[PDB]
């Protein structure tokens, strides 16, 4: 499990989405290095312009690349489910707006870690932040809190992303998360801990298509 992440791992992310009827498709590529918990990814909208703001998709677009310090390595559920993988399901509720419902399959295909995501959004107002494209191209990073769910044999996470609106307001995104392993072998189930996130978004100056460059540092903490 954790032996699969000792070196740099190439990454493929494929996303199919529909929000209030607006279909779109996103593909991402890059690499991960869990020794330093580093993610470098570039996503592109293959269906033209994205009908939602890119920041709203950052959390949906590989926590198995988190660096768990040595003293916490028995709490790494994500890497314990590899190579057969795990299913990541989320419900991202946007305040005074709609919600994303995502289901992702995260496993290895050879040496490549593949994240295949289906996203469905409903109840979005066309003049509100998301569909109105009123969110700034930035990201406020915080901690993701993880608890074990022994009965369903996985984990759960509950965190809230704050999106800066162009007018100075803040659009909240309530994330409920579940992860369930695909394989039947036993996995590591953790005590309560958290992932510390550092996220930067940027642009590729030579990329003509609607895209987003993503740099992520994910580290576990909360257990001494």
Structural class: mainly beta
**H/E order of the elements?**
EEEHEEEEEEEE
- Helix content, binned percent: under 10%
State the total count of DSSP E strands.
11
Shape: globular
Proportion of strand residues: over 45%
Radius of gyration: 17 Å
CATH 4th-level superfamily: Green fluorescent protein
In the CATH scheme, what's the topology name? Green Fluorescent Protein
CATH architecture term: Beta Barrel
Explain the overall architecture.
The structure is a monomer. Helices cover about 0% and strands about 50% of the residues. It has about 220 residues and is mainly beta. The protein is globular. It has a single domain (about 1-224), classed as Green Fluorescent Protein (Beta Barrel), CATH 2.40.155.
Short structural description:
It is classed as fluorescent protein. With 224 residues, the protein is mainly β. The chain is 2% helix and 50% strand.
